[PDB]
Symmetry: C2
Subunit: 382 residues, 2 copies
């Protein structure tokens, strides 16, 4: 309980959240790393350094079962060791997938509002970017399956599924994924399942890995998972990509190979060793801190900033806030946020359709700091 009350000085660690701006007054609620690493990981790093050579390394011989135990323990999902491919980050895994399974000018589908690199790795690779925006319903979000099918029909070859979905916190139901999977089989669509928030699911929700539902879906899906957001080690660049389809996996690794890829750095393996073995109770406690943090913020906004709409999150530590009642431009919202509130939130307009007049804030903070964020929002717009 007394582990996560920790306000931590992250100024002067060259961290992208706190060291880009140097007005000391600012609070940065926009980037997606936590204000929290479990002790067994930092202990693991000190141990590895005790051997003073840092040359080329293979993945540790025990990493494959560690990973196969991790998926089965956490999602009741059984994987084969030979399905596992390493990636020094998930965004390169998307770009690799775009290159591996689509040709130039072919259609890549995404579901906005969505983490912008979904947009960027498509267009910067000359693939045609297609969208099927999500629909705001029941004060949360749903998939417009009719619109989605219409898009699949125009020749979509590849879809990027974000699950849990950044920035809206949707944790997809088993049934939603089965309706979607049925559409990918119908139109033979390969799915990249960005499931990097796989492990921060709130109490009343269950992460269902898309590939886990059926052998059909498994043979058409590239699953991207990682302890980076989960354990706050994003700067170490450790991701796990799971491709049961051997033929898809080979074409995936051939893209990596021609890009000079030779596996993760030494500390990415070490960290991921400890992350998936020696940190279970830290993760159980960190889930309840954030979920309880979420409920605090939504209660705060009803009592204190009633001008503001909030998507009820179901996983990860991001909070999606609709500001449309303020009837404010992005420019006049952002500038007011920095000048009057002394805070940098995440602007929603860069997330595509349905991001406009929204902001996002990071609730991966000690509660105290969340108090400070909520108070400033309140002061900002009223």
């Amino acid at each position: 309980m007394q582990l996560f009350h920790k306000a931590i000085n992250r100024r002067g660690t060259h961290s992208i959240k706190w060291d880009t701006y140097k007005n000391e007054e600012l609070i940065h609620a926009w980037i997606a790393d936590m204000d929290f690493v479990p002790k067994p990981i930092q202990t693991a790093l000190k141990q590895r350094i005790k051997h003073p050579i840092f040359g080329y390394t293979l993945p540790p011989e025990n990493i494959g079962d560690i990973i196969c135990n991790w998926t089965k323990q956490q999602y009741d999902w059984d994987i084969q060791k030979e399905w596992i491919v390493f990636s020094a980050g998930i965004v390169p895994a998307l770009s690799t997938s775009i290159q591996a399974f689509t040709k130039e000018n072919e259609s890549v589908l995404v579901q906005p509002p969505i983490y912008p690199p979904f947009f960027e790795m498509v267009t910067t690779n000359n693939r045609q970017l297609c969208v099927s925006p999500l629909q705001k319903q029941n004060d949360t979000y749903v998939i417009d399956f009719k619109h989605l099918e219409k898009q699949f029909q125009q020749g979509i070859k590849l879809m990027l599924l974000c699950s849990p979905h950044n920035p809206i916190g949707r944790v997809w139901t088993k049934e939603e994924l089965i309706k979607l999977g049925s559409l990918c089989t119908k139109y033979n669509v390969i799915v990249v399942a960005d499931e990097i928030h796989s492990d921060i699911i709130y109490a009343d929700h269950t992460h269902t890995p898309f590939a886990s539902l059926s052998e059909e879906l498994a043979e058409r899906t590239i699953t991207c998972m990682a302890p980076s957001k989960t354990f706050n080690i994003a700067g170490l660049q450790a991701s796990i990509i799971i491709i049961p389809n051997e033929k898809l996996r080979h074409a995936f690794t051939a893209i990596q190979y021609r890009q000079g890829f030779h596996g993760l750095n030494i500390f990415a393996y070490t960290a991921m060793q400890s992350a998936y073995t020696e940190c279970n109770d830290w993760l159980n406690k960190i889930r309840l801190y954030i979920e309880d943090n979420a409920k605090f913020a939504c209660e705060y906004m009803k009592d204190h900033i009633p001008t503001l709409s909030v998507t009820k999150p179901e996983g990860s530590f991001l909070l999606w806030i609709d500001c449309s009642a303020l009837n404010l431009s992005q420019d006049e919202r952002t500038k007011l946020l920095e000048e009057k509130g002394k805070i940098i939130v995440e602007p929603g307009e860069k997330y595509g359709l349905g991001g406009e007049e929204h902001i996002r804030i990071n609730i991966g903070c000690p509660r105290s700091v969340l108090e400070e964020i909520l108070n400033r929002l309140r002061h900002t717009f009223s």
Copy 2:
């Protein structure tokens, strides 16, 4: 001092060096990382940052840009601008990025064998036309057949991969050799990617010349790749420095990495490389003198003890290029004998292109103890 005589037990450390095969007497002389511990200031730099127990996304160190310009000026008399510096998680991804940025499919990329195999792999796996200009074994070493090299340039070469110092033959190119190379690249508009990852281990009678350093013309048509990985045994930290003076080429390079989702080095590449170019000077000058002494030890040892094998004299790096053709044995009957009779796996020359056949390469970046034993095992194998 007693820094480099300490043999290190690195089987059971998941490093590619001693963990491929699991028969313990075996020596695997084929890996090109050294058997020397990282300088203590690097281990201290790593321990220091680990005291801050968060490891999120981090920006490059605000002082890294002047550190690198200080490094290039100090080590090679090369003045560079901070904005030329581009980061890369290793040299091979920088070889590939350069191919994708500056040549289209089927356009011709030339390499000079015998050469490090990734030079070929990134050309062919990238669907570019592979051309060659093999080096010539001349006066006990290797030289460039400039007339052949030119004959290829006339046939439309768009990009050249220069490795300098040359892995595995150890050649540190003279300014005069490189000046002749540059003038040919200007004439036929060849872009040069300069593999200079070995720039910092040069022996006593030789000087490393950055190709881009010679002239402004050559700087604006050259991508120079550098790294502390080989110099200080931190390859697994995946830290490289790419210096692209031409603004238009630099944007085309950065544009390829960006579309491949690249977002810069890991936290410990930044930490480690800072110390490498600041707090490790005296560790390096000892290690260049150590390796040179090992290199001078291997070539007279085999001359006096294993006369069946010719040895190209190295001028830099910690690799040694050994001509075995006098046995006149195939690759398999060489590899087989080396493991059963000598209990040793060396790096096979045949995968190095023309000039690789019946050559082997051993790593001499090891304590003398092991180099004795390797040469000793070489002796028994071939005699």
